[PDB]
Design an enzyme around this catalytic site. Structure first.
Site, PDB file in Angstrom:
ATOM      1  N   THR A   8       0.698  -1.326   0.000  1.00 53.27           N
ATOM      2  CA  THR A   8       0.000   0.000   0.000  1.00 53.27           C
ATOM      3  C   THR A   8       0.710   1.349   0.000  1.00 53.27           C
ATOM      4  OG1 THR A   8      -1.647  -1.271   1.194  1.00 53.27           O
ATOM      5  CG2 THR A   8      -1.920   1.079   1.341  1.00 53.27           C
ATOM      6  N   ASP A  32      -4.384   4.082  -2.594  1.00 52.71           N
ATOM      7  CA  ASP A  32      -4.364   3.331  -3.846  1.00 52.71           C
ATOM      8  C   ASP A  32      -5.352   2.170  -3.713  1.00 52.71           C
ATOM      9  OD1 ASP A  32      -2.589   1.739  -2.098  1.00 52.71           O
ATOM     10  OD2 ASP A  32      -2.147   0.617  -3.931  1.00 52.71           O
ATOM     11  N   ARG A  45      -4.411  -1.387  -4.736  1.00 52.31           N
ATOM     12  CA  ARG A  45      -3.726  -2.651  -5.009  1.00 52.31           C
ATOM     13  C   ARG A  45      -3.615  -3.483  -3.738  1.00 52.31           C
ATOM     14  NH1 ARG A  45       1.946  -2.918  -8.332  1.00 52.31           N
ATOM     15  NH2 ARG A  45       0.440  -2.478 -10.006  1.00 52.31           N
ATOM     16  N   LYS A  59      -9.489   0.523   0.473  1.00 47.16           N
ATOM     17  CA  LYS A  59      -8.661   0.715   1.667  1.00 47.16           C
ATOM     18  C   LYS A  59      -9.173   1.834   2.571  1.00 47.16           C
ATOM     19  CE  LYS A  59      -4.690  -0.796  -1.026  1.00 47.16           C
ATOM     20  NZ  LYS A  59      -3.208  -0.781  -1.129  1.00 47.16           N
ATOM     21  N   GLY A  65      -0.875  -2.352   5.674  1.00 53.64           N
ATOM     22  CA  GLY A  65      -0.344  -3.495   6.422  1.00 53.64           C
ATOM     23  C   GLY A  65      -1.107  -4.767   6.115  1.00 53.64           C
ATOM     24  N   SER A 104       3.898   0.938   2.045  1.00 54.86           N
ATOM     25  CA  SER A 104       5.138   0.690   1.299  1.00 54.86           C
ATOM     26  C   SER A 104       5.541   1.880   0.436  1.00 54.86           C
ATOM     27  CB  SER A 104       5.016  -0.565   0.422  1.00 54.86           C
ATOM     28  OG  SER A 104       3.883  -0.502  -0.429  1.00 54.86           O
ATOM     29  N   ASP A 149       6.259   2.960  -6.533  1.00 55.94           N
ATOM     30  CA  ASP A 149       6.255   1.821  -5.613  1.00 55.94           C
ATOM     31  C   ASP A 149       5.561   0.620  -6.248  1.00 55.94           C
ATOM     32  OD1 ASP A 149       6.639   0.405  -3.169  1.00 55.94           O
ATOM     33  OD2 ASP A 149       4.564   0.839  -2.605  1.00 55.94           O
ATOM     34  N   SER A 193       2.196  -0.669  -4.682  1.00 55.39           N
ATOM     35  CA  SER A 193       1.018   0.165  -4.876  1.00 55.39           C
ATOM     36  C   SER A 193       0.720   0.310  -6.357  1.00 55.39           C
ATOM     37  CB  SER A 193       1.247   1.540  -4.262  1.00 55.39           C
ATOM     38  OG  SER A 193       1.717   1.419  -2.934  1.00 55.39           O
TER      39      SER A 193
HETATM   40  C1  04C Z   1       0.175  -2.697   0.319  1.00 55.78           C
HETATM   41  C2  04C Z   1      -0.463  -3.336  -0.961  1.00 55.78           C
HETATM   42  C3  04C Z   1       1.281  -3.608   0.876  1.00 55.78           C
HETATM   43  O1  04C Z   1       1.818  -4.389  -0.202  1.00 55.78           O
HETATM   44  C4  04C Z   1      -0.928  -2.501   1.471  1.00 55.78           C
HETATM   45  O2  04C Z   1      -0.273  -2.399   2.745  1.00 55.78           O
HETATM   46  C5  04C Z   1      -2.039  -3.560   1.576  1.00 55.78           C
HETATM   47  C6  04C Z   1      -3.055  -3.018   2.572  1.00 55.78           C
HETATM   48  C7  04C Z   1      -4.401  -3.372   2.298  1.00 55.78           C
HETATM   49  C8  04C Z   1      -4.833  -4.245   1.287  1.00 55.78           C
HETATM   50  C9  04C Z   1      -6.188  -4.525   1.122  1.00 55.78           C
HETATM   51  C10 04C Z   1      -7.135  -3.947   1.963  1.00 55.78           C
HETATM   52  C11 04C Z   1      -6.727  -3.082   2.974  1.00 55.78           C
HETATM   53  C12 04C Z   1      -5.371  -2.805   3.134  1.00 55.78           C
HETATM   54  N1  04C Z   1      -1.528  -4.815   2.130  1.00 55.78           N
HETATM   55  C13 04C Z   1      -1.812  -6.017   1.603  1.00 55.78           C
HETATM   56  O3  04C Z   1      -2.451  -6.204   0.567  1.00 55.78           O
HETATM   57  C14 04C Z   1      -1.219  -7.195   2.376  1.00 55.78           C
HETATM   58  C15 04C Z   1       0.267  -7.167   2.165  1.00 55.78           C
HETATM   59  C16 04C Z   1       0.903  -7.833   3.220  1.00 55.78           C
HETATM   60  C17 04C Z   1       1.055  -9.219   3.193  1.00 55.78           C
HETATM   61  C18 04C Z   1       1.714  -9.876   4.232  1.00 55.78           C
HETATM   62  C19 04C Z   1       2.226  -9.150   5.304  1.00 55.78           C
HETATM   63  O4  04C Z   1       2.888  -9.794   6.304  1.00 55.78           O
HETATM   64  C20 04C Z   1       2.136  -9.996   7.496  1.00 55.78           C
HETATM   65  C21 04C Z   1       2.089  -7.764   5.332  1.00 55.78           C
HETATM   66  C22 04C Z   1       1.432  -7.108   4.291  1.00 55.78           C
HETATM   67  N2  04C Z   1      -1.784  -8.432   1.827  1.00 55.78           N
HETATM   68  C23 04C Z   1      -2.544  -9.262   2.558  1.00 55.78           C
HETATM   69  O5  04C Z   1      -2.828  -9.095   3.746  1.00 55.78           O
HETATM   70  C24 04C Z   1      -3.034 -10.497   1.797  1.00 55.78           C
HETATM   71  C25 04C Z   1      -4.466 -10.280   1.296  1.00 55.78           C
HETATM   72  N3  04C Z   1      -2.963 -11.664   2.693  1.00 55.78           N
HETATM   73  C26 04C Z   1      -1.815 -12.343   2.854  1.00 55.78           C
HETATM   74  O6  04C Z   1      -0.765 -12.069   2.271  1.00 55.78           O
HETATM   75  C27 04C Z   1      -1.877 -13.536   3.815  1.00 55.78           C
HETATM   76  N4  04C Z   1      -1.756 -13.045   5.188  1.00 55.78           N
HETATM   77  C28 04C Z   1      -1.739 -14.259   6.025  1.00 55.78           C
HETATM   78  C29 04C Z   1      -1.588 -14.013   7.499  1.00 55.78           C
HETATM   79  O7  04C Z   1      -0.402 -13.218   7.647  1.00 55.78           O
HETATM   80  C30 04C Z   1      -0.482 -12.000   6.898  1.00 55.78           C
HETATM   81  C31 04C Z   1      -0.533 -12.253   5.439  1.00 55.78           C
HETATM   82 MG    MG Z   2       3.709   0.698  -8.685  1.00 60.49          MG
END
Ligand code: 04C
Ligand code: MG
Ligand code: 04C
Ligand code: 04C
Ligand code: 04C
Ligand code: MG
Ligand code: MG
EC number: 3.4.25.1
Lengths: 204, 196, 222, 195, 222, 212, 233, 195, 196
Positions: free
Chosen positions: E1, E17, E19, E33, E47, E129, E166, E169
């Protein structure tokens, strides 16, 4: 010892014109050893369909759990649960086990009986809802399914055409994954009829 | 962090930088590290932001409840509540807190509470990562019963050096003056203190 | 501790026709979550109608291409300006890669060109020298997305003849350069959508008996 | 504990289970029966961690027998297997899980059909024509893929089972001291004494 | 994000964003989000995706009950206090990084909360991020006494910096404007600068391409 | 991988699958796992793909140099020992190779030698090597007799790979058959499992576990 | 196997219509301690190239000596050392790139990120990056460390692709660089206010600027910010 | 590799060596001869790490055969064992040591006495009336302590050896596929084909 | 260790404490950390005693051999030899060395060589564990072109504070004055400097 990739398996769901499709492979193995070629991963509660990939014991446990919950829902509400509502129920249930989760990749699919709108949704193991217009993928060959769906898919497909697209997405993705395949099932879902087809695929 | 509290003739003054870091990235360059737990009892926070914040909130709650029953608490009482939290939860806390307050009987008082949870009453106290670089300077330059202007200069020059050498410290220099007159907030910008 | 490897991302793709061959690769270069370059070519003309790309860790990739290019040069000096055939180049590359078996080049290598019968040829390698001639290969970060799509559209896998009760397979046939470039462009746009390390630009090198032609296309920059 | 096999044929379910109980560099016993009768027409073989196996098997046995007395009625093989699976499914997320894999061979008297269920220690249940736990499967599954037919008799099933045991005795590293074979059919459970 | 929050004349604006990622794979190309805690208190989340959704709903639920109990419109500091005390209790294991913003009888507010339960105050903030790409833009263009239209522009520009630069995102820009004395306007997909280009080919298969073994009608009725 | 080769009345059968894996990723379905060293020598390969490919091709060079120097085709024993002595020099370095050197010479007759990367070298009549060797053994052992015909032996080798291709997740693609006689090796075609399975299921009446 | 001790932070750079700009602050950090304040991290080679180096300073000083020695070696038996056979940016880069990769391959890297900015003999702008791993890449804008995360986004708003380079003047390009240096000073905990900037133009040549400072900083808004949530005083 | 035994009797030395060659969950061969003839009246059995065993055995064999040709004379069992021990004693402090344990059974023609030496991979040599390497010893030593007599005949020695193999087949966990027995005496080395 | 070297009008002065520690035990309380590598080129040693000692010996050998062939070496040359050893053997050395020398052309010069092996020419330099506590003090109090008496007071007050706060530093304050006049050794005892 990675729960998500012991038994293996895949599920894919797609939307079409006034219809949805959900499909899954039939393999259940213990790592390299293929054990069962009849293990279906798609279930249904009324008109709402649920596909579940991942650790097979949890696939079974959750099916039994959602059957349990949807049955009590129906008795108290005096009506069948809808896909949007069921999607929320799945998310709640998964997140309830936040720090000891079911190692699964569920996929909801179905048509809302009131509005008639096609609906699909995916989740991570922890409950995060992934809603989508086009398609949802899940399982050990999710990368493959993403690549197949993203290229093959187009909107407003007719049920008979949608069947071909989802089937070819599943089959070609499954053949590039060691832990998926061994047979496949495709559900074509229209407003008030559902057709279930078993696909012929390579058995290795 | 670089933080300090200094007693003087009319009372006590708290001083702090404004830099919050998550690694080498500055998450917040205008942080307020001087926090009110009571009318004329304040504290400087160093270490874990989350921990010091959670502690300060609990202390503020206790002293508010103390005031409702027994009237205004002493600065010593405030430091005792801080200590109790920091000491009993030492295994789960990274908090270095300086407590400073003004009574009318006891005048200005400064208590420092390091990681362990021990209490130390001092004429002045320094703490946080950037304090290491000014032990020499502060010891040579501190005098008891300074004036307000002298104490403000002492804190400004000290934190200026602490900021200059410590990468984990920077931004503006916030200060809070505690006297019988009341509570006064001061701020000093880089363009001023850097060229001291 | 010092880690000598890194992941520069991106993805590459090789398709062979009847009298031609294409080697495509996106022009994005990355480390972690940062974009380093939106246009950094990694598909190279190495002479003798051989195109090469070594996707993965760019330092090792550039090093390998550099060495192979030099290998072609010394092949001419030592063997009276003889043309290095695609099959010979492939074997030579295996020895380059396997030469560092115990401290590998972290790259999935693909070369393309024409065989000695004038027909299109794509060879593909693992990081330690294992190779195989194919009609079709995707390599790199988004290989898992693109490869099954190619199996379906280039080799007509899982496709049967309509109305034959799944008994007669769809017959294999060569694709035209126009049809191949369509599949390449759709493969990369699809991979760009779902893979974060793929995007910015697409550069295709087409190899016919006439020589090596280039084509560039924009990709999504997010 | 090591080798447990199961073969469902036309009119019966046949369970083979190795007799060796080894610990360290000593075969402590070569006549061990790795099974319990859950009900008159339901048999469960088991293999896994020492102690856990029998403790689990007897615990299940007690529960099924308690059900039979309470209702004056035998539970179906499907129902018993579902009960067993749930117990293992609870177990796996316990402080100390049962490390036991089981085969449940039973004859359903209402359907007049033999049934074979394979359940691992995670609680992963599958109905099969033939099953195996541990390293046995790596030999027997491919062998049965070839030689198994769904309409076989019990006698044909025993010959098919002999073919498995011979292959295991040839290629398995460890001496498992032969097998105890048991047949489950419409007339109940009986043991083949000469194998 | 990438998420941001910007204060202006008569209120506050937040943006994000759309994604969602799992590893290098884009799981959702258009996720929401921006979260509604109360009608005029909104929350941008970065997160662990499920944690930002779950924590914001839980607090939002308790805020609603609190608002009914007290017969008052809820305050941002109440949501801030409830969030940070919850997150702190779990010692960072609930991986929610939030930008909390809104208007209430006290005025307009803008805060950020970290997973471990530390809170910051600011006129402009960014998390996720792509927070460094966003903060670079905010630091370059932010000024005191911004108007509504200027704040929306600055906010969406900061999100774009994340989208392009990024890899974590991408896709679209969501915005929510919370002005004093007015209803909060949630601008879903305020910008959509990443529309997928027309595919080169239609991959609609001839009917009967897929081989079938069995057919059956499924009973969904009672 | 799954590779086998067995001795019988009519010479040697050699059968291999054609799958390459990179974890659970299927890297290839069309890989060659039999190296033709000379008209009378074959080498099957299982394990690390490059290790196998590189050193078996290298073995062919050493066998060529032998017959140039000695004016006589290398023995199956000597050829296998060149390779086993080579991998023994690399013991501990992490080479992964499961090979079977199959061939015919006048002095030896039909001979099979199992050689692997930890230095084991064994002469024998039947061997199965690879991730799906156990599955192949199950079918092969239970149907093997010395008096098998060339037609039956070829099929048993094909059917044993098919069995493993089915059950083993890291085996499949297609079956490559070979038959080694006194006159040399004879190739008996590539057999895709995609068609071969259903052909075998229908004709043989086996694979009843699968949904027909 | 190394660990960096005395370190230099971001080096930022970009192309403009007639040449290239490069900049880097004058700080030699010792962990969190801002130890050395008079460190020049831009090193000119001839009158047509500037090498900007971040990371370990001891390794930077080694690279300085290698470049210094490269100029000497090039002059040997070379009448055209200050003309046709002068050192090009592309020659200087490839040399360093070769060294960096050879050292990483011997598991003993020069713990640096390097940007070679210059102008070729035919007037073409040269700007290319190389680091401890031997990874090389070129772009209209290049930056190391925090610069990659914060500077590049700002510099790419000016020159987003190749076609934007002729449209960018030296005034616009320099302003963007100086702005980026300020943003880095706000947000990089191992940065300093003092910095050096270099412009290599194909017409006006090498312009090396020393003792620059970050100025026009916004700090006034800080006075209004009270506490961390529920504080009013 | 696993079971290698040795029994010195009145007029001969008898070496038994298991036939199984196992790798993973597969017995690759059940007719393996784990021995080499070093000279006409000297036999060495071996067991240990895969590859090392044969490589070492053949290397020793080559050296002893080279000595025999050079001097036109057979080396004594004592001399051969001392040579072997020294090679293993060097090995253990090498970059990669031979992990091989051996028994050297020989008939000394000058003394007219059978001799049995047991040497482990460290280079620990001992002359014994009976010897064993690996887990075998834990059963056979106590058995031989009881039943062994120094003045036994070769036929009595074979019956004594049968008693060991029976005990091992009963109590050992792994199937070692029987043994190849060889006798070393005044007339040289010969193999017992029916055991 | 606490060590420092300071240039001034007439030349340069080196300063050091005298404490050598093996853990919390003081192995030697009268150590001489100021060591001669040439007539008027000296160095202060901090870090590993064994390493700095072995280095200083090699440097002394090189500069003696330099003098035999090319006459008196510059202070820069001495620092270059130190650097060469420290840099090329950085993986196996824990040595922080300050090099100070007096030329007649270049007057007083100070080069500091931290752990990495980098060289830094400075007006004055501080180093060793106890130097952290006097960055603030030394920066505020240092002036260029000081007198001999002013520089001696500057070093004495600085090392006094460094010693006061650093447990790893203590004992006597040794100093070495490098000027055109020659080489002068100074010493200062606890009873004097402690009560400054
Ligand atoms: C950006 C895209 C980070 O790459 C954002 O922080 C985004 C926030 C968001 C997304 C959708 C709705 C609301 C907010 N974060 C994610 O998409 C997140 C990225 C992420 C994965 C793992 C992490 O380590 C703990 C930290 C951040 N993605 C997820 O949560 C996805 C949908 N689920 C997983 O990857 C599986 N979980 C399993 C349990 O442990 C956490 C990861
Ligand atoms: Mg990008
Ligand atoms: C200076 C920077 C260093 O001592 C100050 O102590 C400063 C104090 C402060 C900051 C903001 C508000 C009030 C007071 N501390 C920080 O900026 C602090 C640095 C720090 C983090 C974690 C520590 O161990 C638990 C010790 C010091 N920064 C933070 O807390 C930031 C907001 N969060 C993180 O870095 C994430 N941490 C969370 C705790 O666990 C490790 C990761
Ligand atoms: C079956 C499929 C088991 O995987 C076979 O053993 C097969 C045999 C084979 C023979 C010739 C050509 C292709 C394939 N083996 C593989 O496909 C092999 C499996 C394997 C991978 C890694 C290993 O670690 C030593 C051992 C076995 N797959 C590969 O070699 C793949 C294509 N390459 C890599 O994974 C690259 N790695 C190899 C090890 O060194 C680092 C790079
Ligand atoms: C102060 C004490 C700390 O920095 C000084 O640097 C001082 C310098 C000195 C001492 C004597 C003569 C000249 C200069 N250093 C020490 O007193 C030193 C402390 C030290 C030891 C080891 C280190 O890492 C290798 C770093 C600092 N003390 C010693 O060397 C003593 C004599 N020896 C030990 O403590 C035994 N060491 C040997 C090296 O390996 C660790 C155990
Ligand atoms: Mg398979
Ligand atoms: Mg002291």
């Amino acid at each position: 010892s990675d729960p998500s990739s012991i038994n293996g398996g895949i599920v894919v769901a797609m939307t079409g014109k006034d219809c949805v499709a959900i499909a899954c492979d039939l393999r259940l193995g213990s790592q390299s050893l293929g054990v069962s070629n009849k293990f279906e991963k798609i279930f249904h509660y009324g008109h709402v369909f649920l596909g579940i990939t991942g650790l097979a014991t949890d696939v079974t446990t959750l099916n039994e759990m959602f059957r349990y919950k949807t049955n009590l829902y129906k008795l108290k509400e005096e009506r069948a649960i809808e896909p949007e509502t069921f999607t929320q129920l799945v998310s709640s249930s998964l997140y309830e086990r936040r720090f000891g989760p079911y190692f699964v990749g569920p996929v909801v699919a179905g048509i809302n009986s009131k509005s008639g709108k096609p609906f699909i949704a995916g989740f991570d193991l922890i409950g995060c809802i992934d809603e989508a217009k086009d398609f949802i993928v899940s399982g050990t060959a999710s990368d493959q399914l993403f690549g197949m769906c993203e290229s093959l898919y187009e909107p407003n497909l007719e049920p008979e055409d949608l069947f071909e697209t989802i089937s070819q997405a599943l089959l070609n993705a499954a053949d590039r994954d060691a832990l998926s395949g061994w047979g496949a099932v495709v559900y074509i879902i229209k407003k008030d009829e559902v057709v279930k087809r078993y696909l012929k695929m390579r058995q290795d | 962090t670089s933080i300090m509290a200094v007693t003087f003739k009319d009372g006590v003054i708290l001083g702090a930088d404004s830099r919050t870091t998550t690694g080498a990235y500055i998450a917040n360059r205008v942080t307020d590290k001087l926090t009110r737990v009571h009318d004329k009892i304040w504290c400087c926070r160093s270490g874990s932001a989350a921990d010091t914040q959670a502690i300060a909130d609990i202390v503020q709650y206790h002293l508010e409840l103390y005031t409702s029953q027994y009237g205004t608490p002493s600065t010593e009482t405030a430091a005792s509540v801080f200590k109790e939290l920091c000491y009993e939860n030492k295994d789960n806390l990274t908090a270095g807190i300086i407590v400073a307050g003004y009574d009318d009987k006891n005048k200005g008082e400064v208590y420092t509470i390091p990681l362990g949870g021990s209490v130390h009453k001092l004429p002045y106290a320094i703490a946080g990562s950037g304090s290491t670089f000014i032990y020499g300077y502060c010891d040579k330059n501190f005098r008891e019963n300074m004036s307000k202007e002298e104490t403000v200069d002492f804190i400004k020059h000290s934190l200026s050096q602490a900021i200059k050498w410590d990468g984990s410290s920077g931004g503006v220099i916030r200060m809070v003056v505690l006297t019988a007159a009341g509570v006064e907030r001061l701020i000093f910008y880089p363009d001023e203190y850097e060229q001291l | 501790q010092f880690n000598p490897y890194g992941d520069n991302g991106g993805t590459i793709l090789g398709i062979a026709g009847e009298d031609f061959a294409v080697l495509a690769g996106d022009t994005r270069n990355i480390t972690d979550y940062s974009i380093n370059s939106r246009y950094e070519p990694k598909v190279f003309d190495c002479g003798d109608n051989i195109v090469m790309s070594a996707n993965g860790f760019a330092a090792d990739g550039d090093a390998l291409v550099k060495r192979f290019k030099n290998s072609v040069k010394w092949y001419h000096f030592d063997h009276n300006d003889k043309k290095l055939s695609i099959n010979s180049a492939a074997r030579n590359i295996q020895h380059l890669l396997y030469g560092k078996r115990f401290f590998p080049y972290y790259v999935h290598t693909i070369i393309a060109g024409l065989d000695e019968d004038g027909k299109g040829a794509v060879y593909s390698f693992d990081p330690v020298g294992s190779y195989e001639r194919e009609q079709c290969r995707a390599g790199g970060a988004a290989a898992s997305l693109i490869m099954p799509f190619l199996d379906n559209q280039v080799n007509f896998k899982n496709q049967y003849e309509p109305g034959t009760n799944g008994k007669v397979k769809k017959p294999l046939k060569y694709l035209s350069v126009e049809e191949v470039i369509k599949l390449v462009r759709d493969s990369f746009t699809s991979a760009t959508e779902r893979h974060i390390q793929v995007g910015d630009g697409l550069e295709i090198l087409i190899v016919t008996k006439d020589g090596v032609r280039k084509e560039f296309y924009e990709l999504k920059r997010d | 504990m090591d080798i447990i096999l199961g073969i469902r044929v036309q009119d019966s379910v046949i369970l083979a289970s190795s007799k060796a109980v080894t610990r360290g560099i000593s075969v402590l016993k070569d006549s061990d029966d790795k099974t319990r009768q859950l009900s008159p027409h339901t048999l469960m073989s088991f293999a896994g961690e020492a102690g856990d196996t029998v403790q689990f098997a007897e615990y299940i046995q007690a529960n099924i027998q308690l059900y039979s007395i309470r209702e004056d009625y035998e539970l179906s093989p499907q129902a018993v297997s579902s009960f067993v699976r749930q117990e293992l499914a609870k177990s796996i997320r316990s402080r100390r899980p049962y490390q036991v894999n089981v085969l449940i061979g039973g004859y359903d008297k209402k359907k007049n059909k033999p049934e074979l269920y394979q359940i691992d220690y995670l609680g992963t249940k599958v109905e099969l024509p033939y099953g195996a736990h541990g390293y046995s499967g790596f030999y027997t599954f491919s062998l049965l893929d070839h030689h198994y037919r769904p309409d076989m008799t019990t006698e044909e099933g025993l010959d098919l089972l002999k073919l498995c045991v011979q292959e295991l005795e040839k290629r398995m590293p460890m001496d498992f001291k032969g097998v105890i074979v048991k047949i489950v059919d419409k007339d109940g459970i009986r043991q083949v004494d000469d194998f | 994000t990438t998420i941001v929050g910007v204060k202006f004349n008569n209120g506050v604006v937040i943006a994000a964003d759309t994604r969602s990622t799992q590893g290098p794979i884009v799981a959702d190309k258009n996720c929401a989000k921006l979260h509604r805690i109360s009608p005029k208190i909104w929350c941008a989340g970065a997160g662990t995706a499920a944690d930002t959704e779950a924590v914001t709903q839980l607090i939002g639920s308790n805020i609603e009950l609190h608002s009914l109990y007290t017969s008052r419109e809820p305050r941002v500091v109440s949501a801030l206090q409830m969030l940070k005390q919850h997150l702190f209790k779990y010692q960072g294991h609930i991986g929610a990084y939030l930008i909390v913003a809104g208007v209430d009888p006290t005025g307009s507010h803008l805060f950020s909360i970290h997973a471990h339960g530390s809170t910051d105050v600011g006129y402009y903030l960014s998390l996720g991020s792509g927070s460094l790409a966003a903060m670079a833009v905010l630091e370059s263009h932010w000024k005191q006494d911004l108007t509504k239209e200027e704040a929306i522009k600055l906010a969406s520009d900061a999100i774009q910096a994340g989208i392009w630069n990024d890899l974590g995102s991408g896709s679209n820009v969501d915005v929510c404007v919370m002005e004093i004395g007015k209803d909060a306007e949630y601008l879903r997909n305020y910008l959509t600068p990443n529309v997928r280009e027309e595919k080169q080919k239609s991959y609609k298969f001839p009917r009967g391409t897929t081989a079938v073994l069995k057919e059956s009608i499924v009973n969904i009725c009672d | 991988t799954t590779t086998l080769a067995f001795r019988f009345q009519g010479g040697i059968i050699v059968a291999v699958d054609s799958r390459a894996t990179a974890g659970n990723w299927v890297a290839s379905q069309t890989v060659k796992k039999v190296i033709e060293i000379n008209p009378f020598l074959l080498g099957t390969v299982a394990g690390g793909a490059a290790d196998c490919q590189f050193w078996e091709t290298w073995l062919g060079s050493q066998c060529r140099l032998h017959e140039l120097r000695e004016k006589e085709r290398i023995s199956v024993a000597a050829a296998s020992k060149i390779l086993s002595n080579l991998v023994y020099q690399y013991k501990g370095a992490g080479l992964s190779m499961g090979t079977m050197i199959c061939g015919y010479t006048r002095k030896e007759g039909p001979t099979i030698y199992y050689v692997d990367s930890d230095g084991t070298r064994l002469k024998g009549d039947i061997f199965c090597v690879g991730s799906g060797q156990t599955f192949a053994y199950g079918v092969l052992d239970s149907n093997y007799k010395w008096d098998l015909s060339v037609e039956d032996a070829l099929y048993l080798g094909k059917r044993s790979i098919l069995a493993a291709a089915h059950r083993d997740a890291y085996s499949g693609g297609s079956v490559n058959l070979y038959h080694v006689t006194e006159d040399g090796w004879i190739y008996h075609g590539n057999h895709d499992v995609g068609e071969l399975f259903w052909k075998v299921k229908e004709e043989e009446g086996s694979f009843n576990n699968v949904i027909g | 196997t190394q660990q960096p001790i005395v370190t230099g932070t971001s080096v930022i750079s970009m192309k403009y219509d007639n040449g290239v700009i490069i900049a880097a602050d004058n700080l030699g950090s010792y962990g969190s301690l801002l130890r050395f304040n008079g460190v020049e991290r831009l090193i000119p080679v001839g009158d047509n190239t500037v090498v900007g180096i971040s990371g370990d300073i001891s390794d930077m000083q080694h690279i300085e000596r290698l470049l210094k020695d490269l100029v000497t070696e090039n002059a040997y038996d070379n009448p055209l050392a200050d003309a046709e056979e002068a050192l090009e940016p592309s020659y200087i880069f490839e040399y360093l790139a070769t060294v960096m990769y050879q050292r990483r391959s011997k598991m003993n890297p020069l713990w640096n990120a390097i940007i070679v900015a210059g102008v070729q003999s035919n007037g073409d702008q040269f700007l290319r990056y190389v680091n401890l791993l031997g990874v090389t890449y070129s772009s209209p804008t290049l930056a190391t460390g925090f610069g990659a995360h914060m500077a590049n986004p700002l510099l790419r708003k000016v020159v987003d692709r190749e076609s934007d380079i002729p449209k960018t003047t030296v005034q616009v390009a320099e302003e963007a660089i100086v702005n980026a240096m300020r943003v880095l000073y706000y947000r990089d905990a191992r940065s300093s206010r003092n910095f050096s900037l270099a412009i290599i133009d194909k017409n006006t040549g090498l312009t090396f600027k020393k003792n620059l400072q970050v100025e026009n900083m916004k700090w006034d808004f800080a006075k209004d910010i009270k506490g961390y949530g529920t504080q009013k005083i």
